[PDB]
Amino acid sequence: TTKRKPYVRPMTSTWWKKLPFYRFYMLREGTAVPAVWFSIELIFGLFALKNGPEAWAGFVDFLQNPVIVIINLITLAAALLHTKTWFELAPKAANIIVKDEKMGPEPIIKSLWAVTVVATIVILFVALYW
Amino acid sequence: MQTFQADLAIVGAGGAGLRAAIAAAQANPNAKIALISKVYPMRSHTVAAEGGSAAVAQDHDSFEYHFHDTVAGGDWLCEQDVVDYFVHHCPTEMTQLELWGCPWSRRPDGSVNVRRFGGMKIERTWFAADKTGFHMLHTLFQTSLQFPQIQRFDEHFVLDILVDDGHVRGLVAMNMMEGTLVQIRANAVVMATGGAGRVYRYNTNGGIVTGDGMGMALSHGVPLRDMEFVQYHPTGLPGSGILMTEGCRGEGGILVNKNGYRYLQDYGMGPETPLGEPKNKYMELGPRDKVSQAFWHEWRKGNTISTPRGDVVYLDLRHLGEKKLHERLPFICELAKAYVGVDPVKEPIPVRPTAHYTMGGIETDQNCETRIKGLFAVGECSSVGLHGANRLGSNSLAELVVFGRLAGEQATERAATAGNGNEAAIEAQAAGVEQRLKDLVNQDGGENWAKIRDEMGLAMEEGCGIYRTPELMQKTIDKLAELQERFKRVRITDTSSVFNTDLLYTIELGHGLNVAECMAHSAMARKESRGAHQRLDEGCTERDDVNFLKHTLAFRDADGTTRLEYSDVKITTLPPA
Amino acid sequence: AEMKNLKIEVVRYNPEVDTAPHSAFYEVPYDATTSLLDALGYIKDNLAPDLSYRWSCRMAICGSCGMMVNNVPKLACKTFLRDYTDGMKVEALANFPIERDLVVDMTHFIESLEAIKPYIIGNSRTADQGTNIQTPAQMAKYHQFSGCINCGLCYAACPQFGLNPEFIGPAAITLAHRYNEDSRDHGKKERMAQLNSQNGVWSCTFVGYCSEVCPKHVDPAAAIQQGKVESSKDFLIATLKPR
Amino acid sequence: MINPNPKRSDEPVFWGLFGAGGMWSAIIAPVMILLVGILLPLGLFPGDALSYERVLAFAQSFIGRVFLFLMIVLPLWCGLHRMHHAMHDLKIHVPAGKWVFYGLAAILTVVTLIGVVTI
Numbered sequence A: 001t002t003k004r005k006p007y008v009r010p011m012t013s014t015w016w017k018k019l020p021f022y023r024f025y026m027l028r029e030g031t032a033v034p035a036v037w038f039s040i041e042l043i044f045g046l047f048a049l050k051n052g053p054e055a056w057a058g059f060v061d062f063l064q065n066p067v068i069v070i071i072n073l074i075t076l077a078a079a080l081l082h083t084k085t086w087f088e089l090a091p092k093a094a095n096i097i098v099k100d101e102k103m104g105p106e107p108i109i110k111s112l113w114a115v116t117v118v119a120t121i122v123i124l125f126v127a128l129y130w
Numbered sequence B: 001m002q003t004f005q006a007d008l009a010i011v012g013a014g015g016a017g018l019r020a021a022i023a024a025a026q027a028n029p030n031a032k033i034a035l036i037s038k039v040y041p042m043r044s045h046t047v048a049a050e051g052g053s054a055a056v057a058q059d060h061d062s063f064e065y066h067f068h069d070t071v072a073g074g075d076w077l078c079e080q081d082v083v084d085y086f087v088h089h090c091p092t093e094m095t096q097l098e099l100w101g102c103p104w105s106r107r108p109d110g111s112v113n114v115r116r117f118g119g120m121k122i123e124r125t126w127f128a129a130d131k132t133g134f135h136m137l138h139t140l141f142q143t144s145l146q147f148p149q150i151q152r153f154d155e156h157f158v159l160d161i162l163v164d165d166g167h168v169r170g171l172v173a174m175n176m177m178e179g180t181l182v183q184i185r186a187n188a189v190v191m192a193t194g195g196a197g198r199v200y201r202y203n204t205n206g207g208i209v210t211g212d213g214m215g216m217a218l219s220h221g222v223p224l225r226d227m228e229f230v231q232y233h234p235t236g237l238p239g240s241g242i243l244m245t246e247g248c249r250g251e252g253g254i255l256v257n258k259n260g261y262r263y264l265q266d267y268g269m270g271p272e273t274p275l276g277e278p279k280n281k282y283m284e285l286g287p288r289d290k291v292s293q294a295f296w297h298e299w300r301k302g303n304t305i306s307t308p309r310g311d312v313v314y315l316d317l318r319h320l321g322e323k324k325l326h327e328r329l330p331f332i333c334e335l336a337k338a339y340v341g342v343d344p345v346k347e348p349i350p351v352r353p354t355a356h357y358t359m360g361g362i363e364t365d366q367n368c369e370t371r372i373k374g375l376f377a378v379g380e381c382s383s384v385g386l387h388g389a390n391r392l393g394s395n396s397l398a399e400l401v402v403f404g405r406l407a408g409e410q411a412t413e414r415a416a417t418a419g420n421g422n423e424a425a426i427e428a429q430a431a432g433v434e435q436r437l438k439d440l441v442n443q444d445g446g447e448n449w450a451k452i453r454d455e456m457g458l459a460m461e462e463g464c465g466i467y468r469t470p471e472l473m474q475k476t477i478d479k480l481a482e483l484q485e486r487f488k489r490v491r492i493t494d495t496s497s498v499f500n501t502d503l504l505y506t507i508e509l510g511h512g513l514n515v516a517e518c519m520a521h522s523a524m525a526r527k528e529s530r531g532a533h534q535r536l537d538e539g540c541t542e543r544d545d546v547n548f549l550k551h552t553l554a555f556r557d558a559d560g561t562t563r564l565e566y567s568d569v570k571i572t573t574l575p576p577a
Numbered sequence C: 001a002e003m004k005n006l007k008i009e010v011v012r013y014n015p016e017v018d019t020a021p022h023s024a025f026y027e028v029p030y031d032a033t034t035s036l037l038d039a040l041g042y043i044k045d046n047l048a049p050d051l052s053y054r055w056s057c058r059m060a061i062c063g064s065c066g067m068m069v070n071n072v073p074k075l076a077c078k079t080f081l082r083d084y085t086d087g088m089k090v091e092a093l094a095n096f097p098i099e100r101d102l103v104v105d106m107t108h109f110i111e112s113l114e115a116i117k118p119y120i121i122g123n124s125r126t127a128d129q130g131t132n133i134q135t136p137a138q139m140a141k142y143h144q145f146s147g148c149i150n151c152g153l154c155y156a157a158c159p160q161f162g163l164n165p166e167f168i169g170p171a172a173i174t175l176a177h178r179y180n181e182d183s184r185d186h187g188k189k190e191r192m193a194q195l196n197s198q199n200g201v202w203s204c205t206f207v208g209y210c211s212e213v214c215p216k217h218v219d220p221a222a223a224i225q226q227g228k229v230e231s232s233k234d235f236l237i238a239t240l241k242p243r
Numbered sequence D: 001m002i003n004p005n006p007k008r009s010d011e012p013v014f015w016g017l018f019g020a021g022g023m024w025s026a027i028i029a030p031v032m033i034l035l036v037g038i039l040l041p042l043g044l045f046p047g048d049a050l051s052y053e054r055v056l057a058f059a060q061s062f063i064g065r066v067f068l069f070l071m072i073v074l075p076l077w078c079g080l081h082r083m084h085h086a087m088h089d090l091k092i093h094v095p096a097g098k099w100v101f102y103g104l105a106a107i108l109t110v111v112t113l114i115g116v117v118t119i
């Protein structure tokens, strides 16, 4: 018969709305939804692409819808946020010691970001120039 | 109450206690060990140390050099056969710590680096960055988890110890969360409760440091030894008393007055040494005693700067530069930035001499055993005979691991050949502790425990400071006697059972008051100036091996009076002139 | 010069009396120096002696001041009143059961920390032989992770520990990682049990907030992630064992 | 106590894929959303570069066949994995999520793998 009543605070399904850190984390995690959406869109593309000129031209018409464009514009910003954030976090998986000091993360963050840029170009160059 | 069976009980989970707990679980794998602490072990004040631990390591060093550095450092009030034991067991203990995973800072060759502390000629202070204490305790605590034989009573406040027929038989302690009394019956008991600096208003110590272990020893007619010796640290922040390590001055930092004059040269510590080159024992690396004293001398001249928090001198570290700053002393930067709002690269730091270490403590013999058989005291709450009249910088942590080991080992021997005490007589002891506690709870008188506390701090700081006169010593003895009376009129308003701090802080205050009276009387009586004890009055300004080459023993009688006795100081290889 | 006075909201709870925690208000005089701890002292000293809280070191090295200030895990002695002129609310450390006033049940923490075997293992060296050799480079591996003072702020900050109180937690995982990456230690295999658990590293979604709150700049989030990499290695190297 | 003998979580496999999918998507997703999402449908590209004929030509080639696979597959495993814990984060309970999401991922993976071998 302890005299203590340990009071436990509940945790609401909305714990995250309070602190802006939690909000960002949620929103960052939230980048997945469009990231998956794009992959769906690509399946449509891939599939309608196999079904000859008629299907594909109708698929490009689907992307031509004013809303879908807006949606895709959001999807780009989404995946851009994901990239920005992802790169800030990837280095923290690495534990490299240089000259008796734990390194990171800026050298990695930059390295990675560069690779993104070189890709962006090479791809845009391949896709458009020929 | 709920009674627990243990083979031995240790009060305190600081460096000392933990080293004892570990030692005993190794010395005997089968015993049940009760480790008791009023905070979770990692909170013990040992956690706050920065400078490091002394142990003989360099090839040009010798145990004799470390022996002679300590004895002279304690003004020959050292028990020399204890120092010899101490010096020799240091390198084993620091090595053993390293083996348990203490992150000692290293030479690039992978061997452990050392630096210099407490004006020692040959550098022997092993250090983990500037957080040596945090590392030691966290390594010591973490290590201890591997031994099941240690059962921990975390956040249990020990009220009294159980004694019958001149032998210890256990202790009574409150379960701090439940607020429920518990008997621990141990046939040998170790006191690892640490120092009692907190009885001073301005000090470097954590809250836990209230001297309860000393208070309990007092109550059973065990003398406190060499109590008047309270070590001040030259450089503490004003009004918080937070420690700025010697490391600062060891990295060649400077102390200046309102004129920005590096005054230490005028106090026998000339000549001034160029900023880059900091020579040991000269200026800011000079002898602790004189440095602390130098502040007082400067204070009367109107040379000391005046701030809302107090009169200060400046620890200018600007000239150090951020490269060595953040590598060697990074933690110091953080404190200055936060607690006094001073950026140590841009600005100078206010420092004031501050109460830091209790050379005094529970009288023990070379095995850490007290006048009471089975009862041991180890670490700061003890007086082993190691520090004498003044501790040597970086020797305290070392003491913990050296004698913590011994105390754990020694108490195992005693408990294993103790036999059984009078059960009826023992249980009747616990009844009293319980009743005595209740008597305090009921006690009415509408006196605030906190204001009595506040006043005791002031009396100590003014009457038992770096420089001591009879008048002010007396004033303090008087004031304490007054406060002892007022304590009997304290009324504890919180009568709750669940983690009642009001009650606990008040108990702590009780010990505080008793112990303070030990410090105060001891000081008044010692008519000489040795070590930390510096009297200004005529005929007491100098050291006296003629009349005062002896240990001060302070007893507390049942009538509540502090009676003093004196004991000889044992010498081996190094007598004075 | 009469010091500025400040209204402070402090959430009290007494198990004997109170059904549920309720706020209380205290007016404390403060200056540029006054830390919340300082203020908390004044309360018990002058206004509410019945107040109970955890403190000791006073220099933010012991770790006991764990409490929430305005929905942020903070140290009571590293929290400064001047910074809260707009208003200030003080509940006990989050994600732990409140025993009394600002004191919380810390058992789970201690238990977690214990479960990961945080001590040098399997090193057969002895003290008479001399210390182990470890380079500055070899220390760098775990050194930062070794600086945890056990405040438990990480636990109040991490939302996953909120949702799952069986999650062994940032601090406790970090400490495991610290011993893993110490060259002196050969017990990695003993710790992986707890780490590989669903309640181990894998309860962490990398919210990373623990690292933000860490008073001692330990960055436990990094430990947890390097932990994930390490656990995965072990998951593979375990699956590839036909034996 | 805490569980002395805890089950090894089977999560490493899923986190692994998420790790690669996160990494792929991170680098190569933006440009693609630009190409397929914006440039193609708005006609903002030179001549016949993203015309039916040329796309097909690329998609059918082996290099393209592999690329399209990964560009669809990897972002799913990353994405769905993230959503799975988001359910738990929102305190919303979904029966056999573990099977639901990774199932969906496997399903789509299969559908994708079929697509890139010509339907």
Ligand SMILES: Cc1cc2nc3c(=O)[nH]c(=O)nc-3n(C[C@H](O)[C@H](O)[C@H](O)COP(=O)(O)OP(=O)(O)OC[C@H]3O[C@@H](n4cnc5c(N)ncnc54)[C@H](O)[C@@H]3O)c2cc1C
Pocket (backbone or CB within 6 Å): B011, B012, B013, B014, B015, B016, B017, B036, B037, B038, B039, B041, B044, B045, B046, B047, B048, B049, B050, B051, B052, B053, B054, B132, B133, B156, B157, B158, B159, B192, B193, B194, B195, B204, B205, B206, B208, B209, B210, B211, B212, B213, B243, B356, B357, B378, B379, B380, B381, B393, B394, B395, B396, B397, B398, B400
């Ligand atoms: C800021 C600072 C820096 C220092 N730096 C150094 C240094 O660099 N080198 C060096 O050698 N020395 C240093 N010292 C001195 C040295 O750290 C101490 O002398 C030493 O840590 C004392 O440890 P201890 O084991 O005696 O007890 P402590 O570490 O003080 O622990 C005491 C224990 O007793 C328990 N306790 C107390 N009262 C009760 C009670 N009533 N009931 C139950 N339990 C109780 C406590 O909970 C605690 O666990 C420093 C001191 C300070 C203040």
Ligand SMILES: O=C([O-])CC(=O)C(=O)O
Pocket (backbone or CB within 6 Å): B050, B051, B052, B117, B233, B243, B244, B245, B246, B247, B392, B393, B394, B395, B396
């Ligand atoms: O005084 C000591 O023994 C060592 C100390 O606290 C310091 O780092 O200055």
Ligand code: SF4
Pocket (backbone or CB within 6 Å): C147, C148, C149, C150, C151, C152, C153, C154, C155, C170, C171, C174, C210, C213, C214, C215, C216, C217, C218, C220
């Ligand atoms: S990691 Fe930081 S937050 Fe967490 S307990 Fe350790 S010191 Fe406190």
Ligand code: F3S
Pocket (backbone or CB within 6 Å): C157, C158, C159, C160, C161, C169, C170, C203, C204, C205, C206, C207, C208, C209, C210, C211, C220, C221, C224
């Ligand atoms: S906040 Fe919690 S989710 Fe992981 S990154 Fe820190 S442990």
Ligand code: FES
Pocket (backbone or CB within 6 Å): C055, C056, C057, C058, C059, C060, C061, C062, C063, C064, C065, C075, C076, C077, C078
């Ligand atoms: S008081 Fe020791 S952590 Fe803040």
